[PDB]
Design a binder for this molecule. Structure first.
Ligand code: IMP
Ligand code: IMP
Ligand code: IMP
Ligand code: IMP
Ligand code: 6Q9
Ligand code: 6Q9
Ligand code: 6Q9
Ligand code: 6Q9
Lengths: 332, 332, 332, 332
């Protein structure tokens, strides 16, 4: 008996991938107005933010200025790692000396990454982020495991990115405090194009949460967020926080200079895997200038608070139990 | 066992949302020609219209001129509430003194809305419309309940908007005469975008009717109507009347001045939740000038009468029992 | 238990509608080359054509010139009825006197149509076509029934259009020799838009054939044919012949003058329900000039012969037993 | 009981067709980095390539220059047959004398093709490719069978193209060393348009592999490849090698001259069934100039190596066991 899509193997095409556009949040009974909502959520197992938003570790998104402004908004910024260890560790100190704010930093795998991690820890970093494209590799799982063995008492360790239930479960057993989710959904991403590899984030979050939540490990949604509604959809899918890159790249606190071409205003926004950021799995694009960060954060949270009012969710942990309605291509 | 879209929860993604474009009306045996059709239907439990159409309570759609012309066409207009109570109540009297025509008015929740409601009732209004974005909030359900307790004998009370079966059922038990349906499908709406919250109207109507019809409570379809066919689809989905905003905003009887820019003619059409109508959940757009109201109403009903001829529906109550055929994205 | 698309009624949304773009013909074992294929098929129960194509009864498609050229190509033309009976009957004689060619003519319902039918029969017409938008009306079923009772011995009677199994079955019992299928799929059609009524033709043909074929009554596919592949898809869906309008409107043998505007060449093509052809259910559009008819027919049949080579179909009656593969929106 | 898409026959619409855009590769546990991957795979039952890529047998894609450069890159080129046998056989010798490189050549069916095949074999060709549009014809199956009987000991025989399980199974029993798959998915192809015949390649590969792999016969994916990800998707679907035409037509080693029109650079790329290549089942289009071949091959393989890193596939034979996730139209 042939499978209705080809072959005799039902599990060849495992499941159906849903993205942010595929779904909409169902309104339920509510005692919650946007004003009274509690947007506080867990970034890690130890760290709680007033705003469940994080800025991406990219050289056109998050450094000193951004990382500080993000913390003061209630969230947190993660410093990118496309620069000498000495300066990145220096930026950590600049943030921490601005009022003891929360800050994160990105590291890869290997000796260079390990050395970098130690300097960051000494610099007083709060969260180390093992930044890889495919965290289901056994090298990444070891990088997380040993880091947690050495500095796990005073520093939080986060692994990513994953897109499957098994990958997230592997990170949990590795000792990760949080599991960042997103393989391919990025705006400047071309992993889906050059490798044909990816997983629609709504399904990706749902699968990852199914492995992390039973272990009490927070999940970070990374990439593919175009609007504030996507943030609410991500958290309702089970995620605890959301990492933004495209939505913050046009802000003034973000790296890259202004672009007054065409009479309009833009800012540079490139993937960390773009040819000019070093087979290129990223592109160097532009994003419309969106003014100060605080203005953008205020409206992203505003839409989030609205969704919590529609779904009758007083807290984020309740919003994570909302229900979706599936949307047909005519939904746009 | 994993759900084919993620997670182990089958009810996480509850149902599949259908919109007007997703469906088409199936032709059946007919003794009905468009000329002999009876378009009369129930707006409320007490009030019946010759034309099952209502103009939206928006400051660019329905005031004195529109509300009068709508009644004379067989339908009814609902006065918006973005203006002093004294003037809105005055517009009610202007309509009622033009031949004892039917008129509706919109109110919110709280003290201001209650005071406004009393002035409108004293002004001789026929239908009070509790105009909210999310009527499943217990504050709205109380606003409807107490209003019906005070002036329910001489004034009809309508609650909205809902998008789910449970929400509509709550409005029925609150004592509502009619339940208006539509969360997100509006043309100038951005609730789906900023909050990620909504429900495709065909499914939204079907679910709401499943709760209202057994209680004998009429259902109003609100928003998402681009063509006259959508009106027929809405009523066939179970709705008794349809509320139009975009289709009437370009009419001469509608507020907002003419726009002769580009050598073409347009009129202002903004959502009541747009930034300039006061986190903005609406936009200020333009719609093509469509001449007098009576001309538009005549052709909307004409398409409605045609659909009643194809489906063999002599009355609207029979049209509500028509069958749909589901359309693939290649349907456009 | 709620239906996954709304309501508690599984039959509210009866079935899923497939159009020509939704499907593709599956290649099978073949002893057939395009050269050796037999494109002959049944227009009616008595009449067989060398080419299973018919030109639409429209005032911008089929009159004297077209009806003659169609017959000489192996097919047949159906004269439209937007003109005095005296002239339409005269055009029948002009065709018949050009070598005893096959010709069809369109009539409506009522006294005028009955009188028209008699003049056409006296003029030596071979096929009378009851041309209506909704042939499931009992007035149409009577028009077919009595016509077949009066002149059924020497003239073939065809009813249309239908889109459902029950409608086609009603036409068969009325005594129809052929059942024309198509409600809404027309290019210049707006029935789907103004009335929200229609049925995707692949499904429409499949349902109609399921009622006609057991009774041995040929089925005509009408409207929605953009390419020659659609012709092969229509016949493989069970149809015996296909009626073309858009594909022949740009031909020189078709009514309407040349349009040299923009430096390109077009011809007038309007629906019989367009405002200028007399609530308008049609539009007045333009189609690219495609030269002589014989050139177009030669290439439409060429693509048809190719499909018969891929599917291993020596005759049209074998092609009607081909299998489809369903195509996702990424199919385009 | 009616089938939800029409008719009473469930097998009328056999299965659902998936293309490259419909699917994405699921990331799994990996010990594989792109550097350590082994891209080697089987072109035929006897011949193994270092790079699983083949250039299409088209007069705008693969001749002497291309066929040589392809072999030196690890793959192989297949010489087209739109030229005298004397010259095509001469091009084989030019390739073989450049270091004993691997080369293929295309033949049709009949006497001319048989004579051509013998000259090619004498010219020292390694792979004969029976190039037809529909290899499920019994004439093609005989052409493959007898060729393998005459020169099967010293020359490999490949049949194509197929799109169904039964067609591929027929080629295997005919004695084919490899089965090329692809009916309709070509970029310059119009078989889907003029004949309405085709089969989405992911499903087409899956069905063909289900018949070939049990017999140990390699499968070639032909046409429909827009990106390097599609190559990884094709092989993961079960294919052993992929035939490229559009991706290599813009290369300098490809036939057709440069096109400096519009200030940009293009090259001629026409189907072998295009009107100017001799009912036309092809078109004469243009493709952007992409520089040398080696540069393109290096990046196609680079994306392939990436996908092998994400899916934990050390070898191509392991990549063939990867799992897909189905993507909704919102996936783009
Ligand atoms: O170059 C790249 N290729 C693929 N993914 C990337 C690349 N650079 C950044 N990303 C991911 O995409 C996210 C940004 O997605 P966005 O917020 O939707 O723009 C980042 O936080 C990374 O997880
Ligand atoms: O600003 C807004 N945000 C969201 N929905 C709105 C807003 N303003 C009006 N609506 C709704 O949208 C309807 C109009 O939809 P339309 O007729 O499709 O233009 C109104 O009757 C309201 O129910
Ligand atoms: O004005 C109209 N409204 C709706 N359908 C029409 C109208 N005029 C013609 N048709 C139908 O559409 C067919 C032509 O479709 P086409 O060949 O796809 O252009 C005709 O043969 C009629 O069946
Ligand atoms: O003219 C044609 N009509 C249909 N298919 C063609 C034609 N010419 C080439 N093809 C096929 O399409 C493939 C190229 O597809 P592409 O690489 O996606 O451009 C070739 O290798 C052939 O299998
Ligand atoms: C190829 C690579 N190795 N290490 C990094 C960092 C990268 S990256 O620059 O390309 N970044 C990302 C980030 C998120 C992703 C999700 N899917 N793919 C991704 C790639
Ligand atoms: C946010 C708000 N509170 N009260 C009102 C009135 C509004 S509104 O201006 O935004 N109007 C609507 C009207 C219909 C809607 C359907 N979904 N969302 C909606 C919003
Ligand atoms: C409204 C009407 N009454 N009689 C005729 C003829 C018409 S028409 O001009 O509009 N023609 C058609 C023809 C085919 C159709 C398929 N669906 N709808 C259709 C309408
Ligand atoms: C019509 C014909 N006969 N022999 C050849 C060669 C051709 S072709 O030039 O058109 N080539 C192809 C090649 C691949 C195809 C996949 N589907 N259809 C195809 C056609």
């Amino acid at each position: 008996d042939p499978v209705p899509t080809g072959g005799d193997d039902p599990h060849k095409v495992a499941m159906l991938g849903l993205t942010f556009d595929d779904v909409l949040l169902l309104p339920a009974a509510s005692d919650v107005v946007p004003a009274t909502a509690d947007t506080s959520s867990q970034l890690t197992k130890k760290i709680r933010l007033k705003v469940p938003l994080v800025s991406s570790a990219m050289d056109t998104v998050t450094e000193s200025r951004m990382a500080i402004a993000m913390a003061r908004a209630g969230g947190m910024g993660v410093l990118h790692r496309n620069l000498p260890v000495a300066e990145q560790a220096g930026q950590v100190e600049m943030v921490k000396r601005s009022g003891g704010l929360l800050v994160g930093a990105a590291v890869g795998v290997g000796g260079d990454a390990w050395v970098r991690a130690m300097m960051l820890v000494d610099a007083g970093v709060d969260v180390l982020v093992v930044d890889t494209a495919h965290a289901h590799n056994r090298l990444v799982l070891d990088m997380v495991g040993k880091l947690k063995s050495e500095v796990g008492d005073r520093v939080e360790v986060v692994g990513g990115n994953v897109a499957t239930r098994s990958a997230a479960a592997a990170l949990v057993d590795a000792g990760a405090d949080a599991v960042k989710v997103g393989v391919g959904p990025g705006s400047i991403c071309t992993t889906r194009v050059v490798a044909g590899v990816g997983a629609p984030q709504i399904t990706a979050i749902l699968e990852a949460v199914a492995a992390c939540r039973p272990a009490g490990v927070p999940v970070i949604a990374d990439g593919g967020l175009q609007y504030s509604g996507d943030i609410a959809k991500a958290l309702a899918a089970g995620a605890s926080t959301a990492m933004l890159g495209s939505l913050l790249a046009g802000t003034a606190e973000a790296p890259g200079e202004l672009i007054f071409v065409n009479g309009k205003q833009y800012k540079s926004y490139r993937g960390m895997g773009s040819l000019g950021a070093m087979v290129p799995e990223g592109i160097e694009g532009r994003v419309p200038f969106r003014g100060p960060l605080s203005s953008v954060i205020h409206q992203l949270t505003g839409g989030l608070r609205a969704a919590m009012g529609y779904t009758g969710s007083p807290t984020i942990e309740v919003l994570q139990q909302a229900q979706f309605v599936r949307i047909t291509p005519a939904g746009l």
